[PDB]
Amino acid sequence: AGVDEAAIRATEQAGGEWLSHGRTYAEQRFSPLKQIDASNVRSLGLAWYMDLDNTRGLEATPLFHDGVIYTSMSWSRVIAVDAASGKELWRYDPEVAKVKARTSCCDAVNRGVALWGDKVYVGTLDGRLIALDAKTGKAIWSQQTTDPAKPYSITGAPRVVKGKVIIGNGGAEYGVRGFVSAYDADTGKLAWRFYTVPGDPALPYEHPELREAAKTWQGDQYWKLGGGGTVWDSMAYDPELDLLYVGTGNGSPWNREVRSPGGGDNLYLSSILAIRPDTGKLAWHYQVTPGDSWDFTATQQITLAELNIDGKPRKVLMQAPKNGFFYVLDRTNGKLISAEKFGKVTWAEKVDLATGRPVEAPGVRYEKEPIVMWPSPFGAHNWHSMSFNPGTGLVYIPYQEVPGVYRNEGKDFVTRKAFNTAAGFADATDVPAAVVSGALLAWDPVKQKAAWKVPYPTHWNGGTLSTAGNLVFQGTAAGQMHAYSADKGEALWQFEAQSGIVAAPMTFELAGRQYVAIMAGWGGVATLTGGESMNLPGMKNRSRLLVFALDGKAQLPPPAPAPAKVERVPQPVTAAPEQVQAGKQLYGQFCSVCHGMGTISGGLIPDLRQSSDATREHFQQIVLQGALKPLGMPSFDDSLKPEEVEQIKLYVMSREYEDYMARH
Numbered sequence: 001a002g003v004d005e006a007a008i009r010a011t012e013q014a015g016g017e018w019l020s021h022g023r024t025y026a027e028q029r030f031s032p033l034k035q036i037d038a039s040n041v042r043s044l045g046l047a048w049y050m051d052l053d054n055t056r057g058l059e060a061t062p063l064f065h066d067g068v069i070y071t072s073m074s075w076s077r078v079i080a081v082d083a084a085s086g087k088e089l090w091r092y093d094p095e096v097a098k099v100k101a102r103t104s105c106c107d108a109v110n111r112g113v114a115l116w117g118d119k120v121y122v123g124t125l126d127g128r129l130i131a132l133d134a135k136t137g138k139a140i141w142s143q144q145t146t147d148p149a150k151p152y153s154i155t156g157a158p159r160v161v162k163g164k165v166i167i168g169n170g171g172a173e174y175g176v177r178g179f180v181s182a183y184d185a186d187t188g189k190l191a192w193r194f195y196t197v198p199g200d201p202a203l204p205y206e207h208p209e210l211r212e213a214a215k216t217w218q219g220d221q222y223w224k225l226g227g228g229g230t231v232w233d234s235m236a237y238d239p240e241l242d243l244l245y246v247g248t249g250n251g252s253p254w255n256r257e258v259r260s261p262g263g264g265d266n267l268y269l270s271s272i273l274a275i276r277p278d279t280g281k282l283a284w285h286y287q288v289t290p291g292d293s294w295d296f297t298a299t300q301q302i303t304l305a306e307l308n309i310d311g312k313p314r315k316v317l318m319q320a321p322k323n324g325f326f327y328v329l330d331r332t333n334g335k336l337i338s339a340e341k342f343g344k345v346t347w348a349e350k351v352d353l354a355t356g357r358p359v360e361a362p363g364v365r366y367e368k369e370p371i372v373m374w375p376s377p378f379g380a381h382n383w384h385s386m387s388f389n390p391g392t393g394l395v396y397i398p399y400q401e402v403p404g405v406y407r408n409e410g411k412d413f414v415t416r417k418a419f420n421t422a423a424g425f426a427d428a429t430d431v432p433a434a435v436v437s438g439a440l441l442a443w444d445p446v447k448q449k450a451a452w453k454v455p456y457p458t459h460w461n462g463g464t465l466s467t468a469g470n471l472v473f474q475g476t477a478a479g480q481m482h483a484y485s486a487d488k489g490e491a492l493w494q495f496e497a498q499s500g501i502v503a504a505p506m507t508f509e510l511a512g513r514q515y516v517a518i519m520a521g522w523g524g525v526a527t528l529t530g531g532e533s534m535n536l537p538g539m540k541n542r543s544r545l546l547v548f549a550l551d552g553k554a555q556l557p558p559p560a561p562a563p564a565k566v567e568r569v570p571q572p573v574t575a576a577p578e579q580v581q582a583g584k585q586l587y588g589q590f591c592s593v594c595h596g597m598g599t600i601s602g603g604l605i606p607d608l609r610q611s612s613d614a615t616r617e618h619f620q621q622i623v624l625q626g627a628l629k630p631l632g633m634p635s636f637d638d639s640l641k642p643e644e645v646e647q648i649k650l651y652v653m654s655r656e657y658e659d660y661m662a663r664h
């Protein structure tokens, strides 16, 4: 009763609505709407906005259908907003335990919901796939898709194909076995499940593909460690070819030397899968990063399009994953058409067209010595949306340039109840502004070359939106909403959003008027690992749903200045070097993922260097006795001893004094 395949396909020509995550099943995030164009976007203004009781990352792409905006907020909460009145119609809160974040790698985020019939679908941080009544927001059915005992979580938006709700999950950083499932839209009954990596050999393979994949894995530890290959984000669908395309993630642990000692491609890690939606049977696959040992996922946006290659019309599938190569594949059979670097890439010389395999540079697998390379775990392109404009033939990518540093923990690797990369990710003590940069990259998929590029001081800028009005919209880490000419990248309109933006803009039509909406709420994993680059002006969270339209007259109020804060004058901290070092390591292994690398917090979670004296006195109570558990600060008594927590406190105070002396 409402949203069905015909309705979603129809939006391909009708720009009024946005019924699926990437707008259309092809996920081009291109709107035919052109009331707002390059000639008049200078007149664009804020039409209205909604303040949100949210203080964490907002990554959702809103959906618009029949006058209603459907979106989500941090902690997997869903809200329906009437686009005409601007009033919240209803909200659904799954009530995820705040401490669930201990096993949620990258901020308490949610990329959006899906629509089908008269229901709304959302995935939660604790592994649930829930169906809600579109009109009232009441829960219809709920499925616990993951083992509550394992470090799984759902952050991505589901898609609905032929009456089946498709959703994956995340957790490869902690160590889990990846998979994507299809649930019946009306009942929630599991239709089929495709695991992306093989499981315990002592048990049967769930499907034939796994038997073949198993031949590409070595050793007897990968299934105990999880294996990885989580499907936490992108997927596309072509109804004519009847193929569901899914992107799989990195391995668990990251380091193949520990994950699969003897080597191997480790299928289907970092791969693009073409699956039969009705059965879950694999039609074809393409492995983006064989033997992935760098957190190089292939879960980034998968866009379907029709391009003319060498004078011949081709049905392609495009992706610009973390590894830095831009892929153009024949979406009917998975044959590689082209693959070229779209930014700084030093881990591989190129992707061999004939074999389809990347030609790795010397020492990039860091077996004997640590390696500094590009891209990094943050990726040349992460989840921030890209978009395709059929008119210009260009793909607009939120490019990122950050150095990746990997160390082989090898025999010294120890599985912990925390991140298990086995690649020395814990060694990081900062993300310097000097070593990072970003850019709005207009990529030509046919020529495999940049058409134009707009530079940004840092990475972690928001997704893009393309429209028929020769425009591309994007929000930035620095706190602005932008509009550039699609063809040349000329800056046409800017707006101070009052919050760093990471989500993707979307547009729709209501009563003959075009609106552009964006979920403004600084967040995502980078804001948690922090570092200097993530503490520049504008990188603050002020969660709001912002809606723009021609001649919009709304104005955001000026924030109130922060109260007085007399920083404590740090007394010298004398301690044995090894003791401070022990604290440095323990902190990096267990606390950096939320409080920031080297204690340099990103602002969403407290800076341990600035804790009050009362807080410092209760350090043991907080860390080991869960005194702040109701606020989301986990208790680590299951992993750390009092003396170890003391070593961490010593390290923290050492950094506070170290930094305080920096100034003055």
Ligand code: HEC
Pocket: 101, 102, 103, 587, 590, 591, 592, 593, 594, 595, 605, 606, 607, 608, 610, 611, 612, 615, 619, 622, 623, 628, 631, 632, 633, 634, 636, 648
């Ligand atoms: C994310 C899952 C976290 C990890 C891992 C660690 N901490 Fe944490 N911590 C987290 C939150 C969300 C908060 C804020 C709670 C609130 O609403 O105030 C905290 C807070 C603390 C504090 C108090 C800070 C202050 O108010 O000055 C301390 C002392 C603290 N956390 C310590 C700590 C240590 C030592 C950790 C590693 C073992 C650690 N945290 C991990 C979230 C998360």
Ligand SMILES: O=C(O)c1cc(C(=O)O)c2c(n1)C(=O)C(=O)c1cc(C(=O)O)[nH]c1-2
Pocket: 059, 105, 106, 107, 109, 153, 154, 155, 156, 169, 170, 171, 172, 173, 230, 232, 249, 250, 295, 297, 377, 378, 382, 383, 523, 524, 525, 526
């Ligand atoms: O390995 C995984 O399972 C997994 C899951 C997720 C997630 O669910 O958000 C992210 C990542 N990996 C990841 O590698 C990454 O860089 C990342 C960034 C973000 C974010 O929300 O900003 N999520 C994730």
Ligand SMILES: [Ca+2]
Pocket: 172, 173, 249, 250, 295, 297
């Ligand atoms: Ca990952």
